């Protein structure tokens, strides 16, 4: 897996984010090499930090931490603090629909 040197959303490299007009780093998917500028990915600084501590997956590869599939990807929640994916039906207890408010995962809650 060689990381891409351009952003999937804006097509700029690390020397130019074409949406902000400034240089910006790229983060890259561990599975397929797709890359993006954190701001194009809509990441907070703290989320950018977090995705640097584990094998982050792009929006297309994202698989549920609990069962390991990226199937039923309409049922995946992305944690608001670390971007890990979880099926609503894999959570214990399961939820029928996305919570109205912000939602973060059990791992983030335990940090703390």
């Amino acid at each position: 897996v060689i990381p891409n040197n351009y952003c999937d959303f804006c097509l700029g490299g690390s020397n130019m984010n074409k949406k902000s007009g400034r240089p910006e780093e790229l983060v890259s998917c561990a599975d397929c090499g797709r890359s993006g500028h954190p701001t194009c990915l809509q990441f907070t600084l703290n989320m950018t930090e977090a995705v640097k501590t584990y094998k982050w997956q792009c929006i297309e590869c994202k698989s549920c931490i609990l069962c390991g599939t990226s199937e039923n990807d309409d049922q995946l929640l992305f944690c608001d603090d670390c971007d890990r994916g979880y099926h609503m039906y894999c959570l214990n207890p399961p939820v029928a629909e996305p919570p109205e408010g912000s939602w973060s995962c059990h791992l983030c809650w335990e940090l703390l």
Partner: peptide
């Protein structure tokens, strides 16, 4: 809460491979 669908809408489309 964020899902794959809200994430895709939030960021816009991705370049092809």
């Amino acid at each position: 809460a964020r899902t794959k669908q809200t994430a895709r809408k939030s960021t816009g489309g991705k370049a092809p491979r």
